[PDB]
Amino acid sequence: SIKPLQIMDLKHLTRQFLNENRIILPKQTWSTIQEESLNIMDFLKQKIGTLQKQELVDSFIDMGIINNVDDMFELAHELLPLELQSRIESYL
Amino acid sequence: PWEFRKVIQAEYRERLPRNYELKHWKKPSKIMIGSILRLLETNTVSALDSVFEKYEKEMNQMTHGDNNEVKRIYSKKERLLEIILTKIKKKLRQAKFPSRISERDLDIEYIYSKRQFIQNRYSQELQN
Amino acid sequence: MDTEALANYLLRQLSSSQEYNKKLLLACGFQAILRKILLDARTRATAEGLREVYPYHIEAATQAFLDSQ
């Protein structure tokens, strides 16, 4: 649908990944990732319902993405510029 | 029960594991709820006219040609279906779904035409 | 794009400051999930040694992640 990311969105995400570590990926994998991204959007919506801070933290702890809110804002700091994480740390 | 949520959660538990965080129920998008609903009313109204026309012969057979009372019957069933429809609408408002399904992919007039086109192309190719 | 765009897409799908921060965290989690899936697929492809990665590695990694979680 509208939600799954286009080719350029995945290209920018993998540009961030390349900044983290140089990784090479081909073209048709982007379409496959778009289809599976619609699937994973459904997966995450069923994983995370009405948006609550504790609910989201528990869901991401169960999913293995994070271990606690510490890893929450640590990943936020890793993936984003400074001011947004100043806001996050004020919130978290 | 009438509530969709209980059966929805039970079948989600059947479909998906326990480490899967099913305890969090996504609010479905209003467009998704509207599409599921609209499919429901389209099916209901189509079958409604089909059934009301199908038994009209037998109905006139046993009703001894009373038209005011068949109008009464039609109106009675109409607002029965309206009340059931309002109940289904509110239960779907409280029913939880992932928002990725479109009504266009579950109407039959599109998929049936696609199948007919595919088989016509197959026939032309085999003749060639 | 940006994690802000991902958060905007996620809030569009769902439909203040705390809600926006929750969207940002969820988008970061989505980024981590996608990075893990891509890393698994690339590791499988490099283990095979293909010149180009192919969609079946991607499908296998995504299905493994879906079943595990």
DSSP sequence for C14-66 = H--HHHHHHHHHHHHHHHHHHHHHHHHHHHHHHHHT-SS--HHHHHHHHHHHH
B19 Cβ under 8 Å from any chain C Cβ: yes
Q: Which residue of C has its CA nearest to A87?
A: C21
How far is Cα B80 from Cα B75, in angstroms, rounded to an integer? Answer: 8
From the list C1, C3, C22, which residue is nearest A79 (CB)?
C3
Over the range C54-69, which residues count as b (16 or more CB within 10 Å of their CB) and which as e?
bbebbeebbeebbeeb
Backbone angles phi, psi at B23, to 5 degrees: -60, -25
B4 Rama class: left (phi>0) / alpha (psi -120 to 50) / beta: alpha
From the list B16, B20, B26, which residue is nearest A45 (CB)?
B26
Angle at C67 between CA A8 and CA C37, to 5 degrees: 30
Q: Token digits for C25?
A: 């965290």
Resolution, Å (one decimal): 3.7
Q: Token digits for C21?
A: 């921060």
How far is Cα C69 from Cα B19, in angstroms, rounded to an integer? Answer: 6
**CB neighbours of A81 closer than 8 A, spacing ≥ 6?**
none
Q: Are A51 and C14 in contact (CB under 8 A)?
A: yes
Axis crossing angle, helix A28-47 with helix A53-63, rounded to the nearest 10: 130
Q: For residue C38, what are the CA distances in angstroms to A38, C55, C65?
A: 15, 11, 11
**Cβ pair B29:C13 closer than 8 A:** yes
Q: For residue C67, what are the CA distances in angstroms to A65, B38, B93, C60?
A: 15, 33, 29, 11
Q: For residue A43, what are the CA distances in angstroms to B10, B12, B98?
A: 17, 12, 8
How far is Cα C31 from Cα A66, in angstroms, rounded to an integer? Answer: 12
Method: cryo-EM
Handedness of CA A60, B27, B5, A35 (dihedral sign): negative
